[PDB]
Each structure stands twice: as structure tokens, then as C-alpha cells.
Design an enzyme around this catalytic site. Structure first.
Site, PDB file in Angstrom:
ATOM      1  N   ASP A   8       0.501  -1.107   0.276  1.00 46.83           N
ATOM      2  CA  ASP A   8      -0.142   0.120  -0.376  1.00 46.83           C
ATOM      3  C   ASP A   8       1.148   0.978  -0.044  1.00 46.83           C
ATOM      4  O   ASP A   8       1.897   1.507   0.131  1.00 46.83           O
ATOM      5  CB  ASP A   8      -0.866  -0.190   0.972  1.00 46.83           C
ATOM      6  N   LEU A   9       0.350   2.390  -0.762  1.00 45.77           N
ATOM      7  CA  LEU A   9       0.866   3.832  -0.557  1.00 45.77           C
ATOM      8  C   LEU A   9       0.674   4.514   0.913  1.00 45.77           C
ATOM      9  O   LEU A   9       1.810   4.484   1.630  1.00 45.77           O
ATOM     10  CB  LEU A   9       1.122   4.945  -1.631  1.00 45.77           C
ATOM     11  N   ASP A  10      -0.085   5.018   0.484  1.00 45.18           N
ATOM     12  CA  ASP A  10      -0.966   5.907   1.859  1.00 45.18           C
ATOM     13  C   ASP A  10      -0.970   5.572   3.374  1.00 45.18           C
ATOM     14  O   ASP A  10      -1.752   4.679   3.528  1.00 45.18           O
ATOM     15  CB  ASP A  10      -1.849   6.451   1.785  1.00 45.18           C
ATOM     16  N   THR A  16       0.579  10.137   3.432  1.00 45.69           N
ATOM     17  CA  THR A  16      -0.283  11.226   2.984  1.00 45.69           C
ATOM     18  C   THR A  16      -1.562  10.122   2.961  1.00 45.69           C
ATOM     19  O   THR A  16      -2.548  10.892   3.045  1.00 45.69           O
ATOM     20  CB  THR A  16      -0.003  10.301   1.646  1.00 45.69           C
ATOM     21  N   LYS A  45      -9.413   5.144   4.946  1.00 49.18           N
ATOM     22  CA  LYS A  45      -8.298   4.947   4.368  1.00 49.18           C
ATOM     23  C   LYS A  45      -8.139   3.665   3.124  1.00 49.18           C
ATOM     24  O   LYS A  45      -8.999   2.879   3.516  1.00 49.18           O
ATOM     25  CB  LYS A  45      -6.860   4.276   5.841  1.00 49.18           C
ATOM     26  N   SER A 114      -1.735   0.350  -4.207  1.00 50.96           N
ATOM     27  CA  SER A 114      -2.504   1.419  -3.364  1.00 50.96           C
ATOM     28  C   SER A 114      -3.365   2.197  -4.390  1.00 50.96           C
ATOM     29  O   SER A 114      -3.854   1.040  -5.345  1.00 50.96           O
ATOM     30  CB  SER A 114      -1.368   2.551  -4.057  1.00 50.96           C
ATOM     31  N   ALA A 115      -4.389   2.566  -3.371  1.00 53.19           N
ATOM     32  CA  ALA A 115      -6.236   3.001  -3.855  1.00 53.19           C
ATOM     33  C   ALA A 115      -5.478   4.061  -5.092  1.00 53.19           C
ATOM     34  O   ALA A 115      -7.186   4.163  -5.489  1.00 53.19           O
ATOM     35  CB  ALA A 115      -7.420   2.839  -3.101  1.00 53.19           C
ATOM     36  N   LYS A 145     -10.822  -1.471  -3.032  1.00 54.82           N
ATOM     37  CA  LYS A 145     -10.877  -2.761  -1.984  1.00 54.82           C
ATOM     38  C   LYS A 145     -12.187  -1.634  -1.145  1.00 54.82           C
ATOM     39  O   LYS A 145     -12.577  -1.342  -1.515  1.00 54.82           O
ATOM     40  CB  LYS A 145      -9.423  -1.871  -1.167  1.00 54.82           C
ATOM     41  N   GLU A 169      -0.307  -2.967   4.770  1.00 55.97           N
ATOM     42  CA  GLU A 169      -1.686  -2.153   5.101  1.00 55.97           C
ATOM     43  C   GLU A 169      -1.427  -0.951   6.385  1.00 55.97           C
ATOM     44  O   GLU A 169      -0.742  -1.259   7.138  1.00 55.97           O
ATOM     45  CB  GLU A 169      -2.996  -2.467   4.987  1.00 55.97           C
ATOM     46  N   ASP A 170      -2.039   0.333   5.796  1.00 57.02           N
ATOM     47  CA  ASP A 170      -2.994   0.722   7.145  1.00 57.02           C
ATOM     48  C   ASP A 170      -3.667   0.978   7.234  1.00 57.02           C
ATOM     49  O   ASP A 170      -4.603   1.767   8.413  1.00 57.02           O
ATOM     50  CB  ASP A 170      -2.247   2.013   7.053  1.00 57.02           C
TER      51      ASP A 170
HETATM   52  O1  LIG Z   1      -7.944   9.718  -4.883  1.00 58.68           O
HETATM   53  P1  LIG Z   1      -6.763   9.228  -5.047  1.00 58.68           P
HETATM   54  O2  LIG Z   1      -5.868   9.803  -4.766  1.00 58.68           O
HETATM   55  O3  LIG Z   1      -6.853   8.251  -6.874  1.00 58.68           O
HETATM   56  O4  LIG Z   1      -7.533   7.887  -4.071  1.00 58.68           O
HETATM   57  C1  LIG Z   1      -8.060   7.818  -2.617  1.00 58.68           C
HETATM   58  O5  LIG Z   1      -9.121   8.010  -2.131  1.00 58.68           O
HETATM   59  C2  LIG Z   1      -8.831   7.630  -1.026  1.00 58.68           C
HETATM   60  C3  LIG Z   1     -10.008   8.911   0.102  1.00 58.68           C
HETATM   61  O6  LIG Z   1      -9.979   8.193   1.616  1.00 58.68           O
HETATM   62  C4  LIG Z   1      -8.082   7.383   0.226  1.00 58.68           C
HETATM   63  O7  LIG Z   1      -7.825   6.851   1.635  1.00 58.68           O
HETATM   64  C5  LIG Z   1      -6.847   6.414  -0.538  1.00 58.68           C
HETATM   65  O8  LIG Z   1      -5.919   5.950  -0.004  1.00 58.68           O
HETATM   66  C6  LIG Z   1      -6.463   6.743  -1.743  1.00 58.68           C
HETATM   67  O9  LIG Z   1      -6.413   5.986  -2.700  1.00 58.68           O
HETATM   68  F1  BEF Z   2      -2.144   3.786  -0.775  1.00 61.04           F
HETATM   69 BE1  BEF Z   2      -3.107   2.906  -0.071  1.00 61.04          BE
HETATM   70  F2  BEF Z   2      -4.578   2.558  -0.354  1.00 61.04           F
HETATM   71  F3  BEF Z   2      -3.651   3.506   1.491  1.00 61.04           F
HETATM   72 MG   LIG Z   3      -3.093   3.179   2.952  1.00 57.96          MG
END
Ligand SMILES: O=P(O)(O)O[C@@H]1O[C@H](CO)[C@@H](O)[C@H](O)[C@H]1O
Ligand code: BEF
Ligand SMILES: [Mg+2]
Ligand code: NA
Ligand code: NA
Length: 218
Positions: A8-10, A16, A45, A114-115, A145, A169-170
Site C-alpha cells: 500500500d502507499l498512503d 499521505t 483509508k 495502492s487505491a 478495496k 497496509e494501514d
Molecule cells: O483520490 P485518489 O488519490 O485517487 O485515492 C484515494 O482516496 C481515498 C480517500 O479516503 C484514500 O483513503 C485512498 O488511500 C486514496 O487512494
Molecule cells: F495507498 Be493505499 F490504498 F492507502
Molecule cells: Mg493506506
């Protein structure tokens, strides 16, 4: 031994998740919805942009037009994208750069799961792109997700079965996605938030190759 780590990224690679939270809260309040606090944000998240906005609108049982929905998601994203322009390698979470290096030295594949559609930009901001063998595009999966598709896709993109992968994952949604993919989840955060039924570490400095091995061996 595991053959891939699916990141996962954020909230795993960098802070972030905090910025997503702040941007969604600002958006929610602009439309008169005040329930997006840190507790509620646990439900956001790891959740897609559109699903996130829908959860916020549902919190308040609010309907908006299709046109307004589009505008609101764009408004939050534009704000978020401005917030992250100054992200740099100094913002990589502790332990993460060294983990990527150690994984590569041990011929363990590295994939992003990442999402966020902003994932590739963020990896570039942090000078991390070259560590990743693949990025699973969250716009390519049929289901986001907590569906497992993104983790399955990440594993497949590096030629590894999900069952021979570890996912990091977080989030509640992402832990569920990892479970349902067949990969082994290791969460980062509070068990109060993420559960007492998987391995959880309090911060990313605990994500060492040594520990991932400690966990995989069991
Ligand atoms: O708007 P993005 O950058 O495409 O994406 C998404 O929105 C969500 C908002 O809750 C975040 O929690 C995700 O981790 C992030 O992928
Ligand atoms: F980048 Be992960 F989906 F928070
Ligand atoms: Mg995350
Ligand atoms: Na380390
Ligand atoms: Na070392």
C-alpha cells in the site's frame, strides 16, 4: 520463502493518509457535513476516490446531483494534488527505503497496490519508482478495496502467487483486501483500529526484511 511484497502507499510508504483525511474533511465541511473526524476516516483509508465521497455523503444521508458528485470529487482531488507537490524523499517513512533495498538484494519482487490514482506521481516525488517491479493501476481493476483485486493484480504483475506474497497496509479496507487475496497481511497502526487477528506493528520502522522473515516463518 515469500517471493513478493505488495505495498500500500498512503500511510505505509509515507504520511499521505493524513493529507487525504484533511482534504476530505475540508470538502465535507464545504457541503455542510461535519462527521468526517479521525475515527470516521478509518472507513476512508484505502477506499477509492468515488467510494470515499459516497461514504461521506451517506454519513449525512445526503443526495447530490451526478454533476455535483463529479465536481466534488474533482475539487477534493485538486486540493489533495496541490497539498502533495512538495512531498520529497525526506518524507519516506522510516524503514521503507531500506526495506525496498533489502528486498531487491534478496530478489524479492516489489509491487504497488495502492487505491490512489496519484500513486505513480508520489513514487516519483519520493524517488522510489526504480524500486518497484510493478504498479497495479487501481483504475484497471473491476473492484476496489476491500475487494482483493488490486492485491491479486499486484502479485500477478510481478509473476508471483498472492499466497507467496506479503501485503503491507494501514487500513481496515486494505487488510480485508489482503486477507481475501490469499497474501499474508502485516498491518501498521493501532490494533484498536486494525484488529487483533493479524500481525500489526506500531510504526513502519518495524517493517524490516528480518521481521517479514520472522513473521513468515511464524
Ligand atoms: O483520490 P485518489 O488519490 O485517487 O485515492 C484515494 O482516496 C481515498 C480517500 O479516503 C484514500 O483513503 C485512498 O488511500 C486514496 O487512494
Ligand atoms: F495507498 Be493505499 F490504498 F492507502
Ligand atoms: Mg493506506
Ligand atoms: Na530499516
Ligand atoms: Na542493512
Amino acid at each position: 520463502m515469500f517471493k513478493a511484497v505488495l505495498f500500500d502507499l498512503d500511510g505505509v510508504i509515507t504520511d499521505t493518509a493524513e493529507y487525504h483525511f484533511r482534504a476530505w474533511k475540508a470538502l465535507a465541511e464545504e457541503i455542510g457535513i461535519n462527521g468526517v473526524d479521525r475515527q470516521f476516516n478509518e472507513q476512508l483509508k484505502g477506499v477509492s476516490r468515488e467510494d470515499s465521497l459516497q461514504k461521506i455523503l451517506d454519513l449525512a444521508d445526503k443526495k447530490v446531483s451526478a454533476e455535483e458528485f463529479k465536481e466534488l470529487a474533482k475539487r477534493k482531488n485538486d486540493n489533495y494534488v496541490k497539498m502533495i507537490q512538495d512531498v520529497s524523499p525526506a518524507d519516506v517513512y522510516p524503514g521503507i527505503l531500506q526495506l525496498l533495498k533489502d528486498l531487491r538484494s534478496n530478489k524479492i519482487k516489489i509491487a504497488l497496490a495502492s487505491a490512489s490514482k496519484n500513486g505513480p506521481f508520489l513514487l516519483e516525488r519520493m524517488n522510489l519508482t526504480g524500486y518497484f517491479d510493478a504498479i497495479a493501476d487501481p483504475a484497471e481493476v473491476a473492484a476496489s478495496k476491500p475487494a482483493p483485486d488490486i492485491f491479486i493484480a499486484a502479485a500477478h504483475a510481478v509473476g508471483v502467487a498472492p499466497s507467496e506474497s506479503i501485503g503491507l497496509e494501514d487500513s481496515q479496507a486494505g487488510i480485508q483486501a489482503i486477507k481475501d487475496s490469499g497474501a499474508l497481511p502485516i498491518g501498521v497502526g493501532r490494533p484498536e483500529d486494525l484488529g487483533d487477528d493479524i500481525v500489526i506493528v506500531p510504526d513502519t520502522s518495524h517493517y524490516t526484511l528480518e521481521f517479514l522473515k520472522e513473521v513468515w516463518l511464524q
